[PDB]
Structures are given as structure tokens and as C-alpha cells.
Amino acid sequence: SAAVKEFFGSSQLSQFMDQNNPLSEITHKRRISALGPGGLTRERAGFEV
Amino acid sequence: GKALVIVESPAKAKTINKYLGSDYVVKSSVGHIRDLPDERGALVNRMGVDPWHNWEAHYEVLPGKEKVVSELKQLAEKADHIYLATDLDREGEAIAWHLREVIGGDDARYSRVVFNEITKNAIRQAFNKPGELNIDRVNAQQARRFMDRVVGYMVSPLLWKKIARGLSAGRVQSVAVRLVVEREREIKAFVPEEFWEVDASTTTPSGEALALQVTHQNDKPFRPVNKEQTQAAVSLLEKARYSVLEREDKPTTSKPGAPFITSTLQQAASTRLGFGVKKTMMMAQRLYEAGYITYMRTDSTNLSQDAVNMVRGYISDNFGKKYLPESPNQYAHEAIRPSDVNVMAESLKDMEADAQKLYQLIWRQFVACQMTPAKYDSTTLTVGAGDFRLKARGRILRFDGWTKVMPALRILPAVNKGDALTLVELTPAQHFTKPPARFSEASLVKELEKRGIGRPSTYASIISTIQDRGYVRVENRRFYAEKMGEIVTDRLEENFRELMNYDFTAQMENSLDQVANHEAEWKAVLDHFFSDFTQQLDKAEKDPEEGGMRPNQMVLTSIDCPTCGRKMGIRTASTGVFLGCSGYALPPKERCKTTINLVPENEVLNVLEGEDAETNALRAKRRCPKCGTAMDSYLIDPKRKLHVCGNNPTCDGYEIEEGEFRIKGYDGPIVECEKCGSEMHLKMGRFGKYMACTNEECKNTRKILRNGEVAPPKEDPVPLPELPCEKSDAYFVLRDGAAGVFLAANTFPKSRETRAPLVEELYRFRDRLPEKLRYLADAPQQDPEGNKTMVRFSRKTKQQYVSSEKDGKATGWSAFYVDGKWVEGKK
DNA sequence: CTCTGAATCTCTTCCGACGCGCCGCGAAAA
RNA sequence: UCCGCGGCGCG
DNA sequence: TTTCATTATCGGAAGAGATTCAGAG
Ligand SMILES: [Zn+2]
Ligand SMILES: [Zn+2]
Ligand SMILES: [Zn+2]
Numbered sequence: 053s054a055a056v057k058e059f060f061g062s063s064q065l066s067q068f069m070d071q072n073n074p075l076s077e078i079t080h081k082r083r084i085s086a087l088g089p090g091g092l093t094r095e096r097a098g099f100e101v
Numbered sequence: 102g103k104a105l106v107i108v109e110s111p112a113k114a115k116t117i118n119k120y121l122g123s124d125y126v127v128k129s130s131v132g133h134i135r136d137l138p139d140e141r142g143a144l145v146n147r148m149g150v151d152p153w154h155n156w157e158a159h160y161e162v163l164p165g166k167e168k169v170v171s172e173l174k175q176l177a178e179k180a181d182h183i184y185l186a187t188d189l190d191r192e193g194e195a196i197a198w199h200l201r202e203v204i205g206g207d208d209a210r211y212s213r214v215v216f217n218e219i220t221k222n223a224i225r226q227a228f229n230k231p232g233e234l235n236i237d238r239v240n241a242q243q244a245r246r247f248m249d250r251v252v253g254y255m256v257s258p259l260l261w262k263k264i265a266r267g268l269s270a271g272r273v274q275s276v277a278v279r280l281v282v283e284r285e286r287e288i289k290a291f292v293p294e295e296f297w298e299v300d301a302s303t304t305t306p307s308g309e310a311l312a313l314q315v316t317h318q319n320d321k322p323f324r325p326v327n328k329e330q331t332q333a334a335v336s337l338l339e340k341a342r343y344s345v346l347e348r349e350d351k352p353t354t355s356k357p358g359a360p361f362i363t364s365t366l367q368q369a370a371s372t373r374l375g376f377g378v379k380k381t382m383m384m385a386q387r388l389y390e391a392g393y394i395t396y397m398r399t400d401s402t403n404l405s406q407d408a409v410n411m412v413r414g415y416i417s418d419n420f421g422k423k424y425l426p427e428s429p430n431q432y433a434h435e436a437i438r439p440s441d442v443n444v445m446a447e448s449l450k451d452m453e454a455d456a457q458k459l460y461q462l463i464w465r466q467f468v469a470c471q472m473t474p475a476k477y478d479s480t481t482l483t484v485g486a487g488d489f490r491l492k493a494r495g496r497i498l499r500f501d502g503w504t505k506v507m508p509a510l511r512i513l514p515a516v517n518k519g520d521a522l523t524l525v526e527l528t529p530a531q532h533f534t535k536p537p538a539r540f541s542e543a544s545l546v547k548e549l550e551k552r553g554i555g556r557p558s559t560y561a562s563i564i565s566t567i568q569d570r571g572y573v574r575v576e577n578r579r580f581y582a583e584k585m586g587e588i589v590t591d592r593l594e595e596n597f598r599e600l601m602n603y604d605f606t607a608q609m610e611n612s613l614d615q616v617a618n619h620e621a622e623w624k625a626v627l628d629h630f631f632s633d634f635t636q637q638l639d640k641a642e643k644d645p646e647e648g649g650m651r652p653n654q655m656v657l658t659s660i661d662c663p664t665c666g667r668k669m670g671i672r673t674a675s676t677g678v679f680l681g682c683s684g685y686a687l688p689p690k691e692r693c694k695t696t697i698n699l700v701p702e703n704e705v706l707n708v709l710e711g712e713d714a715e716t717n718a719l720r721a722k723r724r725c726p727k728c729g730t731a732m733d734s735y736l737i738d739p740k741r742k743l744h745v746c747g748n749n750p751t752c753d754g755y756e757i758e759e760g761e762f763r764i765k766g767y768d769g770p771i772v773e774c775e776k777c778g779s780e781m782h783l784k785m786g787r788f789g790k791y792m793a794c795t796n797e798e799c800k801n802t803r804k805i806l807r808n809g810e811v812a813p814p815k816e817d818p819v820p821l822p823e824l825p826c827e828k829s830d831a832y833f834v835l836r837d838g839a840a841g842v843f844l845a846a847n848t849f850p851k852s853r854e855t856r857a858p859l860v861e862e863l864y865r866f867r868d869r870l871p872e873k874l875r876y877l878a879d880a881p882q883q884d885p886e887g888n889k890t891m892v893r894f895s896r897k898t899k900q901q902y903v904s905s906e907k908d909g910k911a912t913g914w915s916a917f918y919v920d921g922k923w924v925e926g927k928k
Numbered sequence: 929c930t931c932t933g934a935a936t937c938t939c940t941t942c943c944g945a946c947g948c949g950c951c952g953c954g955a956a957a958a
Numbered sequence: 959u960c961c962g963c964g965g966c967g968c969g
Numbered sequence: 970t971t972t973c974a975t976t977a978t979c980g981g982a983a984g985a986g987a988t989t990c991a992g993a994g
Contacts (some may be wrong), residue, residue, distance in 0.1 A: 061953075066965090069963080098980085
């Protein structure tokens with residue numbers, strides 16, 4: 053329970069929905085990222101990526 | 102770092118490690134771990150202490166604690182500060198001292214702590230206000246240990262020379278035997294006093310029955326000694342007028358007993374469950390290790406406050422107020438009791454039935470001792486009849502109190518002073534003052550503790566040693582003194598009076614306390630002791646005429662030696678009591694080594710006779726012609742039986758009697774002949790002690806060895822000249838038995854050198870091996886690592902296997918024989 | 929052929945704008 | 959109740 | 970050969986160290 057709760061609450065892949073407009077919700081739900089655990093980092097990201 | 106704590110009992114350790122958890126490493130010594138193995142160097146080497154060199158000693162790890170001591174050494178590095186937590190008494194103090202000298206290190210690395218109880222309120226205070234080991238206490242124990250050593254290793258040899266080989270003497274051992282010897286002589290020399298009793302059945306003015314006992318005649322205790330006198334009295338009582346004189350009603354009380362200390366537990370188990378001392382301790386041991394009760398070895402009947410609140414709490418909920426006393430019952434390790442009062446015997450389904458019975462005994466004693474007493478209304482009726490006085494006593498239970506938890510397994514009719522009684526019948530009864538009861542195992546222990554003779558952890562051990570040594574024997578769960586016991590007891594009392602005095606231990610304890618309290622120095626105390634002892638020993642060594650211990654004394658008798666017909670005499674050896682032919686004392690030319698075994702007639706006390714049973718046993722004995730002493734009885738032929746006086750050999754009376762008798766021919770150990778299944782029996786001769794089989798068609802004989810009951814079988818022996826011995830100049834021979842197949846040295850009783858064979862060895866001498874053994878030579882000679890392989894017996898499966906060792910440890914590789922093939926793998 | 933000195937490689941060490949809004953999280957001990 | 963971190967957006 | 974009692978089973982650049990190769994005697 054603790055691990056699941058902390059994952060759903062604190063992971064950088066658990067973003068805070070903005071819900072300004074319906075399109076905002078859609079574009080945030082369909083967002084794809086290469087960040088998070090197992091991914092890249094902003095500094096290490098080369099120009100090629 | 103991590104702290105290392107050391108206690109004596111493993112069970113107690115596991116329990117301590119709990120109420121302390123990790124960060125600490127608790128372990129147990131499981132006992133002592135170390136002990137002992139003008140002047141004579143050999144004697145000193147044997148004793149392990151030098152009385153002539155300021156008591157320098159030579160301690161050495163017990164042949165069965167190697168592992169135990171070794172694990173502490175590796176574990177000691179991890180521990181920062183070592184905490185010796187053995188018992189506070191001198192024995193425990195000494196175990197701590199030995200641990201500290203076997204583990205090494207620096208004094209500051211050691212600390213001494215004492216655990217009150219298991220409660221955290223104790224295991225905590227343990228490390229709170231600790232201390233270090235006390236030297237005075239340690240030296241006090243060394244003094245006791247050394248005095249016991251000197252006596253045993255210096256007196257026994259004297260016995261070997263004057264009396265017989267294999268004999269022993271000891272501070273505790275020898276007085277235990279003396280007690281049995283004195284009771285034996287007491288029984289044999291006694292004389293029953295026939296006495297009569299008369300009871301009268303009567304009717305009250307109402308019509309109720311009233312039984313009366315005659316107590317006085319002409320104001321003198323009524324006690325006729327014969328039938329004639331009993332009749333003279335009955336004649337008068339038959340015509341007398343009976344009237345009530347007094348009726349004394351009075352409230353009387355009774356009380357539960359104390360919880361069972363090791364000694365009392367043994368006695369209670371013996372009286373209520375028929376358990377022998379050793380058995381009782383075995384069951385108690387199981388119960389302790391399973392956490393149901395506390396330490397099976399204790400001399401204190403004390404109870405902690407928690408224990409007392411726990412039981413009162415239980416009594417309160419299960420019996421009510423009338424059973425709970427206003428305040429805890431008072432009375433003069435802790436006492437043996439259940440670890441949890443809420444646990445009933447019936448719920449221990451993981452224990453044997455007998456262990457449940459023992460638990461129930463311990464439980465009930467613990468709750469009763471805290472329960473209320475049994476109130477009774479006792480009535481005593483006094484009756485007059487002519488010049489006679491008669492009495493009747495009754496009792497009616499009013500309140501069970503403590504007997505509610507510990508049950509054991511009377512109504513006098515209403516009559517007032519002055520009332521007349523009607524005589525119905527008079528019943529005379531003949532009786533015989535009975536001899537003192539014979540000792541039992543628990544009963545002797547009780548006597549020992551009463552005189553402070555032994556120790557809780559040694560009582561059982563004492564009872565066995567005196568039997569194995571042949572001094573006394575047990576029959577019908579009762580002790581009987583053997584002739585040898587009497588012989589040794591008389592010799593020891595003659596030359597070592599001080600040592601044979603019952604209070605020698607008490608006197609020793611006083612001197613030991615003085616050493617423990619800086620009121621005396623230990624070496625000085627041992628020096629005084631040794632001076633007195635040597636004065637007695639030297640005097641005993643001399644010839645009987647100079648006051649020297651009397652050597653044995655053949656007492657002849659009219660019997661025909663089957664080898665030479667001569668008169669035969671009665672003799673005592675460490676093996677027992679036996680019939681010998683005087684040619685034993687004649688040089689070889691005229692020497693006769695024929696001997697006869699003397700089967701005694703075992704006294705069979707009738708439990709149904711109660712107190713009579715011992716008296717009738719004394720009545721059963723013949724009486725010696727030359728003296729009043731009773732006589733003890735032995736069987737020499739199915740046609741002949743032999744009587745011998747109690748004071749033999751001081752008294753020389755003997756009697757021989759004819760009749761038809763079930764003579765067994767032997768007495769001592771039992772062994773089953775592997776070659777014919779018959780009984781096999783233990784025998785003595787020019788080579789000491791051998792073991793030989795009763796079937797006349799079979800002469801198969803085994804033999805005694807240093808540290809076991811009997812050798813394995815003398816079957817299919819094959820000699821090898823080409824294997825030399827290494828500790829001795831001998832050569833090695835190959836032998837088979839239940840133990841296995843083994844190499845042993847041709848002068849075996851002298852060399853006593855044995856080792857398992859290697860496979861390569863067998864292969865080298867494979868032509869010699871009998872047809873069956875050949876398979877072992879087929880076995881793989883070397884393991885996959887190229888280590889070398891040895892031939893072992895798997896006792897659990899009664900088969901040979903081959904196994905390899907490196908640095909003397911097992912490699913963990915084994916090969917076995919399975920259907921004509923040899924199959925190999927990790928152990 | 930063997931050693932010493934300089935080059936080359938391998939490993940270690942630094943450092944990668946600047947403001948400013950938001951959001952939601954952190955730690956328990958017996 | 960003063961702190962740090964993670965993400966998002968603005969230039 | 971042998972006796973006693975007791976106790977309890979990112980990538981790029983710079984710097985320092987280590988290793989190797991070429992030149993001399
Ligand atoms: Zn003879
Ligand atoms: Zn006599
Ligand atoms: Zn046989």
C-alpha cells in the first residue's frame with residue numbers, strides 16, 4: 053500500500069492535471085514523455101534526441 | 102560492537118536472547134567445558150592436581166565440549182565486551198572463570214552479570230549494576246573439587262591393593278553406601294514383637310453403629326503379646342457394661358505442601374506416579390525445554406511476586422474468595438512450577454502421557470500451596486468398660502481449601518457423656534512390630550539432602566554409581582546392601598573415620614565458606630586437610646597388625662568344589678559376592694581357580710501387607726546360631742541353599758539347607774550373544790573382566806573396554822603384519838562387529854589403539870579379506886578432489902559406506918553400495 | 929640486451945544562461 | 959512558519 | 970590399567986598517474 057500510494061503521489065510521471073479547458077485535459081492525457089525513471093534527464097539530453 | 106553473553110543452560114539462553122533481541126549474541130557453555138582428567142608422579146599425573154606442589158592443577162576441555170568451546174573462540178572476536186552470566190554460586194562462578202581462561206583476552210574485556218528472572222524487569226537490571234568474578238568464591242570451589250579428587254584417586258588405589266580392583270571410594274559415594282549398609286544390618290538383626298489389638302462393635306441408645314478400640318486396662322496401655330492374654334481380656338469385655346465418658350469435639354486443620362524442589366518432586370513422583378528418580382528428571386527435562394516449567398534443578402522453594410500474583414489471580418477466578426487467602430501464604434533458582442498457570446496438563450498434546458502426569462503434579466502443588474487449607478470437625482469419644490478405656494475418633498470435612506486442587510485420592514454417631522453402649526462383638530487382632538523399611542531411590546535422596554550430602558544435579562547420578570560399582574542393588578524399587586558394600590563400608594569406617602562421618606560435608610562447607618569470606622586461605626586449608634588425610638592413608642597402607650587396613654578375609658564353609666571337592670569360602674569382589682575355593686591362595690602347582698556365583702534370594706515385599714511387609718521380611722530370615730543377627734540367603738544348587746550371617750565375615754556362622762530351587766547361576770549385567778541369542782554375563786579372571794555366554798554349547802566371549810558397555814563382536818578377525826601401529830610397536834588387525842569394520846592392535850588390552858581403515862589399505866590387502874568384505878575394496882579409493890577415503894558405518898542404516906576427509910574434517914562426499922554398484926555424491 | 933626518459937594512454941575532476949509564477953510533497957517511534 | 963526537492967508554464 | 974563430584978544437556982577539456990616505446994651506452 054505504501055509503495056503504491058507513494059508511486060501514484062510523488063512520481064514525476066504523476067503530473068498535476070491543469071484542466072483549464074477540455075482540450076487541455078485531452079492534450080495532457082495524450083502526452084508522451086521520455087522522462088521519469090528509466091528515461092533521460094534534461095541535462096543529459098543530447099541535441100540528437 | 103555486539104555484546105557476547107554466556108549462560109549455562111541453552112534453553113535459558115534462547116529465552117534471554119529474546120528479552121534482549123539482536124545487537125547481543127547469547128550462548129551457553131552447556132555445563133563446565135573444562136575439568137580434571139610421599140608423592141608419586143604417576144599419581145599426580147592421574148589426579149591432575151599436585152598436593153605436594155602447592156596444588157598446581159591441570160584442567161582440560163571435556164572430551165565432549167570441543168565444538169562448544171571452539172564456537173566461542175571464533176564468536177569472541179565479533180563481541181566487544183564479553184558478559185559472563187553464569188549462576189552466582191561457586192560452581193557457576195568457576196564456569197565463568199574457566200570460560201575467561203579458555204577464551205583469553207584482557208580482563209577489561211570481561212564482565213559478570215546475574216539474571217534475576219526472565220521478566221524484562223530483570224534481564225535489564227542485569228547489565229544495569231553488574232560486577233566482575235569473585236576470586237574467593239572461585240577458590241572455594243577449587244578447594245572442594247580438589248578435596249574430592251584427592252580422596253577418590255588416592256583412596257581407591259588402596260582398595261585395589263587391599264580388597265579388589267575396580268573398587269572406589271568417595272566423600273558422597275561411600276556414605277550413601279554406609280546408609281544402606283546400616284539399614285541392612287538394622288533389618289537383619291531386628292526381632293518382631295507380636296502384639297494384639299481388640300476392637301468392639303457397639304450400638305448407641307438410638308441404634309446406630311459405633312466401632313471402638315481398646316486403649317487401657319487397669320489404667321495401663323492395653324497391649325497383649327499373645328492369644329492367651331487377649332482371651333483373658335475379651336472374656337471380661339464380653340460381660341462388661343459400656344458407658345460414654347467424654348465426647349470431645351474440636352476444630353482441626355491440615356495444609357497443602359510446598360512446591361516441589363528437585364528432591365521433593367522426585368519423592369512425590371515416586372509416591373504418586375511410581376516414577377524413578379532418573380525418569381522423573383527425564384520428563385521434567387522435556388517439560389522445561391518445551392517452556393512449560395522452570396529449571397528442573399533447584400534447591401529453593403521460593404516464588405517470585407509475579408508467580409504469586411499469577412496463581413492468586415487464577416485461584417480468584419476459578420475457585421472464589423473462600424479459597425483465596427487475605428494475603429499470600431508464607432513459608433520457610435526459584436521453585437519448580439508451571440511457567441503459565443493458565444496452561445492445563447490436558448493441553449500438552451505434544452508431550453508424552455507421563456510428562457503430562459508430572460506436569461499435573463507440579464501444577465496442583467503450585468496452586469494448592471497457594472490455596473486455602475482443609476478444615477475438619479474432629480470428634481474423639483472416650484468410653485469406659487470395667488477397668489478398660491476405649492476410644493473412637495471421627496472426622497468430617499467442612500472445607501476442602503487447598504485439597505480442591507490437590508485431592509488425596511468418619512461420622513461418629515450422636516452420643517452424650519453418661520450414655521450407655523450395647524456390646525455387639527469383640528474382634529482381637531494379632532500383629533507384628535515390623536522392621537524398618539528398605540530404602541528407595543527418592544527415599545535415599547531425601548535422606549542425603551536432609552544431611553546436606555549431595556547436590557540437586559548429582560542425586561540421581563549418585564544413586565546409579567553405587568549400583569554400577571556393585572555396592573547396593575535395587576529390587577522392587579527398594580535398595581538392598583550388597584556384601585561388597587558392607588565390606589568397603591567397614592574398611593572405610595575403620596581407616597577413614599572422619600571421611601565416613603555423615604557431617605564431613607557440612608564441616609567442609611564451613612571451611613569453604615571461610616575461604617570464600619577471606620577468613621582463611623585456600624592452599625592452607627587444603628594443606629591441613631591433606632596432612633590429616635595422608636596420616637590416615639599411610640596408616641591404612643600398613644599391615645593389619647600395625648593398624649593397616651584389613652585385607653579381605655576368606656571365610657570357609659562345608660561345600661564341595663566341583664574341581665577338587667574341598668571346603669569352600671565366601672568372598673567379595675567388585676563384581677559382587679561369590680564362592681571360592683581355598684586353592685586360590687596356593688601356588689600354581691596346587692592352585693585352584695574354580696569359582697561359583699552366589700544368587701541371593703530377593704526379598705519380595707508385599708505391597709498389600711503395607712507396614713507389615715518389612716516386618717514379615719525380617720521374620721522370614723533365619724537367625725544365626727552364634728549371634729542374634731539375622732541371616733541372608735543364597736542359592737548354590739537347585740538342590741542346595743546357603744545361609745550367611747549379617748556380620749559376615751566378622752561373624753563366621755554359616756548354614757546349608759536342602760530342597761528344590763530355581764537357581765539362576767549368575768548376577769550382574771545382561772548381554773545377548775550374537776552367535777546364539779542366549780543371555781551373556783560378566784566374569785572375572787586372570788585378564789580382568791570378560792563377557793561370556795550362558796549356553797553351554799557356545800563359548801562366544803566378548804570383553805570390557807575403557808569407555809563402553811562391552812566390545813562389538815569377536816567375529817571373523819583377520820591379521821595384517823604389514824600395517825604398523827604408530828603410538829605403539831604393535832601391528833594392525835581387522836575386525837567386524839555391530840560398530841562396523843575397524844583396525845585394532847594385536848596386544849589389544851595393552852595397546853588399545855584403533856583407527857578406521859582407508860580404502861587404499863584394504864585394496865593393498867584385498868587377497869586377505871573374507872569373501873564378503875571384498876566389496877569394500879572395490880569401493881572408489883579417492884574422491885573427485887583427490888582426497889583419500891575411509892570406511893564408515895552408517896548406524897542409522899546399518900551399512901558400510903566410504904567418505905573422504907580433508908584437514909581431518911569431512912569433505913562432505915560419500916559413496917554407498919546399492920545393488921552391486923558403488924554410487925557417490927555430496928553428503 | 930638493458931635501463932632511463934619522454935610520449936601516450938587511463939583514470940580522475942570540473943562545469944553546462946536567469947529571472948519569475950504555479951503544483952505537492954517531505955519525519956515515527958516503541 | 960520560515961527549508962529543500964519534483965513537475966509545469968512564462969519570457 | 971585407573972579411581973572422584975558438578976552442571977546440563979551527457980560530452981569536452983585539463984591534470985595527474987601509470988604504462989609502454991624509442992634512443993643511448
Ligand atoms: Zn577347588
Ligand atoms: Zn552370626
Ligand atoms: Zn552364545
